[PDB]
Symmetry: C3
Subunit: 383 residues, 3 copies
Amino acid sequence: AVADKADNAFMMICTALVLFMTIPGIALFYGGLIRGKNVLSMLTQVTVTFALVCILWVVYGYSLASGEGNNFFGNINWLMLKNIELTAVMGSIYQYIHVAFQGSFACITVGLIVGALAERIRFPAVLIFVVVWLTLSYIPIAHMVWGGGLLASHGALDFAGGTVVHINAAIAGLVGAYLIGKRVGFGKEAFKPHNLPMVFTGTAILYIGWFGFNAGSAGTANEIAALAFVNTVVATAAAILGWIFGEWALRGLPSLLGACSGAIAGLVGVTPACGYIGVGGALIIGVVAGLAGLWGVTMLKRLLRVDDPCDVFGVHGVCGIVGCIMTGIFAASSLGGVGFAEGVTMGHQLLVQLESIAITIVWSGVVAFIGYKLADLTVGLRV
Amino acid sequence: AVADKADNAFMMICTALVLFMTIPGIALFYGGLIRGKNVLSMLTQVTVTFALVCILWVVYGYSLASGEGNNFFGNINWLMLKNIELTAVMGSIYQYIHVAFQGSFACITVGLIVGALAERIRFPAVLIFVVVWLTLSYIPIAHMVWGGGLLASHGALDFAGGTVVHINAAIAGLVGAYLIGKRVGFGKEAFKPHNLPMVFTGTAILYIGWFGFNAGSAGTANEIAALAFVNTVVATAAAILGWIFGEWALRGLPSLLGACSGAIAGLVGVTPACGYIGVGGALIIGVVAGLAGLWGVTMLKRLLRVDDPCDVFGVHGVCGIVGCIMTGIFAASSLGGVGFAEGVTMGHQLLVQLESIAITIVWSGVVAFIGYKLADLTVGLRV
Amino acid sequence: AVADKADNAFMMICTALVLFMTIPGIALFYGGLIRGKNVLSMLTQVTVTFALVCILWVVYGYSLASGEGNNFFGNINWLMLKNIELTAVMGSIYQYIHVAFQGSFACITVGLIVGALAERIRFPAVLIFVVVWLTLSYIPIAHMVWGGGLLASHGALDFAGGTVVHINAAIAGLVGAYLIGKRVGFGKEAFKPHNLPMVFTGTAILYIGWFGFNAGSAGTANEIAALAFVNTVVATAAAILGWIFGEWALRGLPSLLGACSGAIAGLVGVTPACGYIGVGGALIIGVVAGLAGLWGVTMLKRLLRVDDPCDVFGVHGVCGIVGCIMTGIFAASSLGGVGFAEGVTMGHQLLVQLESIAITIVWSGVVAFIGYKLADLTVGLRV
Ligand SMILES: CCCCCCCCO[C@@H]1O[C@H](CO)[C@@H](O)[C@H](O)[C@H]1O
Ligand SMILES: CCCCCCCCO[C@@H]1O[C@H](CO)[C@@H](O)[C@H](O)[C@H]1O
Ligand SMILES: CCCCCCCCO[C@@H]1O[C@H](CO)[C@@H](O)[C@H](O)[C@H]1O
Ligand SMILES: [N+]
Ligand SMILES: [N+]
Ligand SMILES: [N+]
Ligand SMILES: [N]
Ligand SMILES: [N]
Ligand SMILES: [N]
Ligand SMILES: [N]
Ligand SMILES: [N]
Ligand SMILES: [N]
Ligand SMILES: [N]
Ligand SMILES: [N]
Ligand SMILES: [N]
């Protein structure tokens, strides 16, 4: 095929926006959630694992995620992008841009994990973990969903990565939280309000970059990109309002963290759905996702009983699951969505969504466990 | 018509840039201008009213602002974007992108108001105010200028919103300042220097997003976008220099706040003008706007006698008026501008600009008064 | 020729990204490296000199840098962009966009100098310095490399400005450091860790803007833009890892500043190379550049023996030189690069790179000396 320069332009900018979500979006986001004394370490781990992901992605991750192979992984014919002509076209853009855009997703996924857990994990251990989990969870799941693998073959709908990014990372992060203890200092049982403007700023950068993430997942500056863009605006706004409404009812007042969490919740919830649903579905998914995220972090507080940056994973995990399921509903044309595929009914699609969720949770959780254990066994996990 | 993917790409990115102006640009900007103790509240109000604006815009604001109707408002045929095919084209882009781009303008306009006043207005009251003022001031004025309404019909020149955004918001904000008192704590009579890097960072984000705002108002990545882009660079720079020059003359030294205010002043002043003037006109408008903004905040200090975030409205209001008037001059071809419309002379155009200004000020000020009073009467305005 | 709207769109967004590198990228970057008490001053100087550069660029810099003239400067036929029709096309974009994109490079180059030195230079003096050095170093060197001048005529390879931006600025900054003393307060001999998140955030913004810088230097959203984009990702990541590896070996632990410095090092090192090399060359240049930057700042510490923001110039200078030389190697097709030009062998190309480096260092250093001395003689350099 031949590249469309408009799509090339679009997709390079969307990739820059997705990179912005990690560098510095997620780092600032967690920077506002952890104690001053660990912020330096976290920023270093986020930056160094970002770099590591970037390199592993071009060395082999792109080939194994996006190369044709089997249901679970691709191939090694594109190691260091060998055999990719610079003018090769994937879709309607140069394949190199596709490489970069997909790599950026690997980065924010790993950033979501590392930003939360960095303060409790030894530096060499996080490096080992990322290698293991990027290689054996991110890459196969990305293959499965976006590389023509198992889940794509079953017709799972996941426009921009409710599974590959958010649930995948949430389970890995929650496994890390489970395996790696953290001493909560006296007086540090709740997030420090002084640092919450950094959480806001990170949320804002995540939101703006997420337009690259969601709209860019169209692969072209077309009407699906445009729909994904509008639905990102709408779901995020609806989830901010749903979360703050729920919080105002539960607690009697909105909070900044509630507003930011609601934003993330709608962004996560609409991620799988955004190119497949209408704007009404986006509104409803955003409201539900904001309320579900508030429920999820509320349940995690019952478990953890302190504020912890790993609470983020409750939002990514619960809202990723909610948005993946709700996609199976609101993709219906009767609700203004695109379409199910041939032969597919809503109930079928819902089962496929559930299957995709379950596979992602087990796959990621198993690989994460292995990667933490390997790190533990070789260098020691815990700070 | 058919969409141009280059314009689609351009316009989705410009919309992301405009959203960036609110989230987090204007929030950081005001975060540096208010006291630590109110920053949390302000960020919450900015984020929640942002969300509210986003939802009201898709529910009805787009239809009433941009639908065809009468001189003051459009219609309700596009409620929740019903009847808009995803492949509908407006101009040379998908209509959904137009929806999003226009919504982003509503958001930064409301953010300008809320960021300043949040610290003095009860949360439920700001929500009521935004509903009232978005619905009855923003939407009709946007209709009037960009939806084929009264001011467009009179040939008002306003490329990117000297009226719809800056004067509109400045009057609403100044009415709020007038109606809502604020106790100035001892020792807090001047902006805290420690927090001014946040003002800088917000100004910077407002500046970069403003390229989406001004150039995006061309609706296409053409030579008018390019002119608007260059004139944004030039007017902003010229106003930074004009403000700092005036400050250096008035006070004996430049200041960071002066530099940032000068940036805003040129951005605001060039907003109505940027697609219609030549680069020389942009330079002159920027210098004048920087000096006029310095004059305006100087006059507001005589009234307020303390530093207050509502001083921002002096810049938006004075520089919006100055840029709207100066557009009526520098749009002339003899000064390197585009053009007046058929039959139009400079003096005629100036009257039309003045008329547009006067209408915007009264309309916004009246609706703002009503929205504050309704809030007051129902939930209470004042913190 | 006729403009391609995709390229117009691309290039306006890339220009916004490059502007973002200065406003606020480099300001935040240095804001984290200098003492609280000087940050205000530095931000003011960065913002005001930014504005000055923007205006001088449209008044004459664009014409003298990009107009056809001689080996060292162009002409004055495009003063205030006169004689440029708004629909004039340069390459495949409107010439006005070219103006803006090139101006943005002038801005980040000057920001690199000013951000470092602002805290030690009087305000009027920095203004004089910028006028002199922009006019007599930046503009001629930009002419020389990108305006068809001496270095372009010799076939120097410099895709995005290893010479024009990084070495040029590094020598000017190092001359400033040499000529302008700075009292290091007691207790302030090392960068304050508390402020390093701002260094991270500035690095992040520099990184994301650098996609506009490097990919935008293709002048079109084509496969060279795409290659430049991927190589920016890869070289930056490789240099983060090379620096942190070197640091971990030298010091026993990675640091946040090391990670950020490594990012800058790969960004600088890949700047001249990014459109001419393959992704393997980018990886190798990034590793080498990260290690070379670590060596360079290590040598500057031996000279300075304190942490100082001018240490940045060791990275820009050393890594700019390394990347310019390495471009002469990795541009070879045998290493996956583009190409040398007709008749050119690697050894020839290396000599040309060395020549370009030497000329840039002497030219910039001489003009910088003159500009500092003129400032000193007229208003006084030192705070
Ligand atoms: C993404 C941010 C992650 C942690 C989210 C914190 C959100 C606010 O925190 C949550 O507020 C709720 C009610 O206001 C409570 O019910 C939850 O237990 C509490 O953790
Ligand atoms: C957009 C920022 C809004 C408040 C603007 C503060 C700008 C600096 O503040 C202003 O400085 C002037 C001279 O230096 C004085 O003449 C004004 O009274 C003072 O308010
Ligand atoms: C671009 C940032 C500029 C100053 C760079 C500081 C980078 C970290 O600082 C450097 O760390 C090295 C080993 O860790 C030492 O060998 C150097 O002497 C030290 O200056
Ligand atoms: N995607
Ligand atoms: N507009
Ligand atoms: N360039
Ligand atoms: N995320
Ligand atoms: N994400
Ligand atoms: N997030
Ligand atoms: N603004
Ligand atoms: N704006
Ligand atoms: N602003
Ligand atoms: N840079
Ligand atoms: N740069
Ligand atoms: N930098």
